[PDB]
Amino acid sequence: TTLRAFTCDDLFRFNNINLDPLTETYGIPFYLQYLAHWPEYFIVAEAPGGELMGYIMGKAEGSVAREEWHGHVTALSVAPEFRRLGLAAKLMELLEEISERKGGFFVDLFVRVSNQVAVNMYKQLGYSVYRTVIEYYSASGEPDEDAYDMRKALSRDT
Amino acid sequence: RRLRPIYDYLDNGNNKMAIQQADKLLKKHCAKVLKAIGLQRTGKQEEAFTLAQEVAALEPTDDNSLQALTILYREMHRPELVTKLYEAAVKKVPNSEEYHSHLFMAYARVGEYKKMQQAGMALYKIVPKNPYYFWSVMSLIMQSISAQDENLSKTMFLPLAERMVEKMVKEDKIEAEAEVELYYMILERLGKYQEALDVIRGKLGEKLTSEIQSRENKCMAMYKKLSRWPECNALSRRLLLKNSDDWQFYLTYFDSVFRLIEEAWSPPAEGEHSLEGEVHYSAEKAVKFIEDRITEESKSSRHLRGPHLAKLELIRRLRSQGCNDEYKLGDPEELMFQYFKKFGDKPCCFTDLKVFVDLLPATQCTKFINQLLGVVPLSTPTEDKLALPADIRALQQHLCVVQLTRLLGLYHTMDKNQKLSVVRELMLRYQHGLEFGKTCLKTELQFSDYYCLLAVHALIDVWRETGDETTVWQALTLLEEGLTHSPSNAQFKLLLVRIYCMLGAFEPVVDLYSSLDAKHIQHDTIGYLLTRYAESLGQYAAASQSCNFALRFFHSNQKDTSEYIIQAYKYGAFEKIPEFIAFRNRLNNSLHFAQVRTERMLLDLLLEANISTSLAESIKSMNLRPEEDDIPWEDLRDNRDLNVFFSWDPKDRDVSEEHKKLSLEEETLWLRIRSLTLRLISGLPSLNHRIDILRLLLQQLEATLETGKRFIEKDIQYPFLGPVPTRMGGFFNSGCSQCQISSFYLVNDIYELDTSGLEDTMEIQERIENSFKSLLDQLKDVFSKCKGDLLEVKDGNLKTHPTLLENLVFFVETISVILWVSSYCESVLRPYKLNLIIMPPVFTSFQDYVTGLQTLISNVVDHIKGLETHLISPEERKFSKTVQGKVQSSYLHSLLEMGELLKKRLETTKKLKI
Amino acid sequence: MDVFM
C-alpha cells in the first residue's frame, strides 16, 4: 500500500471507492476546497498496481483560546476489495497525528447511526460519543438518518 | 437602515426578494435594479441585461453593488464583464487593499495572467504586505505555463520570477511555507534541480514541515531528476524502515539499487555512504534488507503485506537481469503459494497476486491451482453433491482460487460444455454462500457475490464465442437474483446496464443507473454508459435527461473550478494552481463533454425543430454557425473509466492500451461525423435571404465517412467489458451516411439553381429531379433494411433483435434531416412557382411520396401490436419472467416514442406540398 | 462522511 496525497486527476479514479451506498461524491467545488485549504488531511492509499484502495478527507476548523480547535474527518472510505486490511485504522491514525501536530484538542466525526460497522470501528479506535444530530443527512425521497457526532480528545493543546 | 432592512428582505427567496425590491423603486438606490435582476435572471436574458448593463456603468464603488454584479456576471458565464467594474472603481479612487485585491481576483478569474502581475505589484507597492508580493510571482508563472514551448518560458518569464523571489531571500522576508513551496516550484521549472534541492535540504526547508512527508518527498524528486542514485537509495531505505509497507518506496529502492549495481558504485572512505547514509550496493545488501523486513514484520500483530510483495518484486527484477544466479529468494511458485496461505481470506489476495502472476513458468498454471486448492478447508466431495466450504474464511480462500483459475487461463480453454459445467458449479457455490452473511445490513455485499460475477463472465463469454442467445437470459436472471439478494453491489448494476443495453432494452438501464448514485464527477467517468445508449435505442426522454445532467455538471465545473483556482491564492497553495489548471483543462477537453454537447444539440433539433419551432429560430437559440466548432479536436481527453468493471480475464484479453487508443480514435471519428452533420444542418437556415462554407463541410464529412469506413474494415474485437464500440459500424450497414450525403448534395444543387434561376438552367433542373428520384430510392432501402421483427419465439427462446431497433432509430434521425433539407428547397421553389415548370412538378411527387413512405414507416412502428401479443430453480424460473418482461416493455417504450415522433413529424409535410 | 451541501 502506497500512502500519498490525493492529487487532482485522482478524482477520475475513485470509482471503486465511491460506488458504495455509504460513500458520497460531494461534487468538484468540495474536493477543490479541501485540496486548496487543507491538503494535509487528504491522504489517499494506492495499491501495487493502480487500484485506489481508499482515501480520507479531513479539515481542522475551530477557534483556539476556547478549546474548540478540532480536527474534523469529512470523509473516509476503503474499496470493498481492500477492506479488513487495517487500512482505515492507518488513515485515521495519520489524521489523528496530523491534527495533533498542529496543536488540536480533539478529533471530530459525523457517522450516520445506521451502520454498526463504522460506529463499532470508531468505538474501538477510541472515539467516544457526543451529541446525536437529528435529521442531519439531508437525502439521497429516502428518509433522513440521524448522525452521531463522535469526538476523541487527544493530547490537549492550544 | 435602508441598506440592511430593505436588502435583507430583498433576498428572501425569489419574489419576496424581487417584489420587496421591485417595490423599492417607488419606495426610495444604486443597486435596486441589480437586486431585482439577480432573482429574475432565470430564463429571460434581455430583461436582466437591460438593468445589469444599465447599472454596471454608473461608477458603483459600493460593496453591495459590486458583490451582486460579480455574481450576476459570473453566473451567466460572462466573467469578462467583472474585471471592468473594480478597475472602473479603481480609476476613481485608489483603494488601499479591498478594491485592488478584488481587481486582482477578477483578473485571475477572467484569465488575464499577464495583466494580473501588474495589479499584484501595484497592490504590493500600496501596502507592503508579504502575501501580495508572491501573488505577482504566481501570476508570472501562470503566464509561463500557458505560453509554453518557447524562449519566453525559461528566458523571459520564469527567470524573471526566480529573480523576483531571490530579491526577497536576500532579506529575511520569506518566513512562511507557501513562499518556500513557490520558490521550489520556480527552481524546479527552470531546470535548476541541483539549486532547488538545496533550498529544501538547507534552512528554508524547516518551514516546510506541514504535510506528512513534504520534505522527503520533495528531496526525492530532485534526487531522481539529478540522477543522484545513492542519496535516493538511502532515503528509500530510511523511509522503509519507518513503515516497511509503502510500495512507492520499495519501487524506488529497487530502482536505485539496480542502477547502483549498473553504475558499479563504490562507497567513500570517510563518513556515511551518501548524504542520507547507509546506501546499499548489490543484491546481497539488497536481499538481506528484504529478508529482514519480512522477519521484522513476522513479529507484529498487524500482518503487513508489504515485504511479501517486495520479495516477489525483487525476485522479478533480479530475474530481469541475471536468472542463473539465485541466492535464497526461492521459487516464485512457493512464494505465491505461501502468500496465498497467509493473505488468502482477504478480498485483496487476487489484486496482489495478479501483478506478479507473470513469474509463473506459464506451463504450471494447472499445477499451481491444484496446489492452492489443497489448503482450503473444504468439505467431503462425494456426498452426492459438491465440495463446499464451511466458514466465511474458507469461502473467500476458495473464491480467490476460482479467480486465480480464471486469470491463469483455464476457463478459456474449455469448449462450451465444461464452460457451462463451470457456471453450474459457480451457481451452486453462490446459492450455498448465502447461508453465511444472512444478517447483512443491506449495505454490505454478500460474502459470495463474486461467485455470480464469475458465473456471468463465463456465460457472456459463451454467448460471444458461439452466438447462443440462450445464455444472455441466464446471465440476466443470475444478475437479477444477485442484485435482489445484495441490492448494493455496483458490479451487478453496471453489468446489468451493459447487458440490457447490448440486448436493446434501455428503460431498466436508466432505472439501474439512477440506483447506483452517480453524482457529479461520476458524470464524466460513468455517465458514458448512459449517453452512448440513450438516444441510440430510441429513448428520447431518458437521453434528454442524461444530456441535461451531464451538461449541468460540466458547466458548473467551468464556473466552480475557476472560482476555486481564485481561492488557491488566499490560502497560499501555490503548488495546486498548476494542478487545478490541468484539472480544469482535462475536464473541459473531455471526450464526453463534446459528445454530450453535440447529442444535446441534435436532440433539441430533431425533437423541436420544424415541429414546434422553426429551424432558424431553433438554431438562433443555440448559437450555432456552420463556421465555428467549440470542440478541441487536438486535446480531446477520453477520461472515461473503462476499468470500473471487475475483470478476472487472463491479463492479455481484458483491456490493452491499443484497445483504449482505438476506442478513443473511433469515438473521435464518430464525434466528427456527428458534429459535421450538426454544423451542416445549422446552415440551411440563413442559406436563404453563404454556400462556400457548407460546400467545404461536405468535403470534410465525405472524407471522414471514408476514414470511418476504412476503420470499420479494420475488424477490431473489443472485450466484453471494454470500450463499447460506437454506432459508426451500424451507421454504414443500414445505409444512412449516403442517404444524408445525397441530401446535402441536393441542398447545394438547389442553392445553385436559386443563384442562377429557372431561365436557362435546364442542366441543373434535371440533376435536381434525378437527385429527388434517387434519394427516395435510398429512403426506401433504409426501410427495407430496417424491416423485421423485434422479438421472436423461435424454439422456445426469445432471440431479441436490437439491430432492427438501431436501424429504426437511424431512419428517424435520417428522415428528420431529409425533411429539414426538403423544407429548405420548398423555400427556394415557392417564390419561383409564385412568379411562374418541369422541376416543381417532380418536387411535388417527391413530397407526395415522402409522405406515403413516412406513413408506411409509421405503420411498421406498429410492432406494438406484435409485441403486446407475446406470451413469454423455482426462483430462477421466476426472474426470467421479469428479465423478459423488462426487455419487452423496453422495446415497447422505444417503439412508442419513435412512433410518436414520426406521427408529429409527418404533420410537417403539410407545409412542403407546393 | 459529511452531508453534500
Author numbering:
A (entry chain A): 2 to 141, 143 to 160
B (entry chain B): 13 to 40, 45 to 705, 723 to 869, 881 to 916, 931 to 972
C (entry chain C): 1 to 5
What are the paper's exact sentences on this?
NTA is catalyzed by a group of enzymes called N-terminal acetyltransferases (NATs), which belong to the Gcn5-related N-acetyltransferase (GNAT) family of enzymes. NatA and NatB are heterodimeric complexes, each with a distinctive catalytic subunit and a unique auxiliary subunit. NatA accounts for 38% of the human N-terminal acetylome, acetylating small N-terminal residues after removal of the initial methionine residue, while NatB modifies N-termini with sequences of MD-, ME-, MN-, and MQ-. In addition, hNatB is upregulated in human hepatocellular carcinoma, where it has been suggested as a potential therapeutic target as silencing of this complex can block cell proliferation and tumor formation. hNatB-mediated NTA of α-synuclein (αSyn) has been shown to increase αSyn stability and lipid binding, and to reduce aggregation capacity.
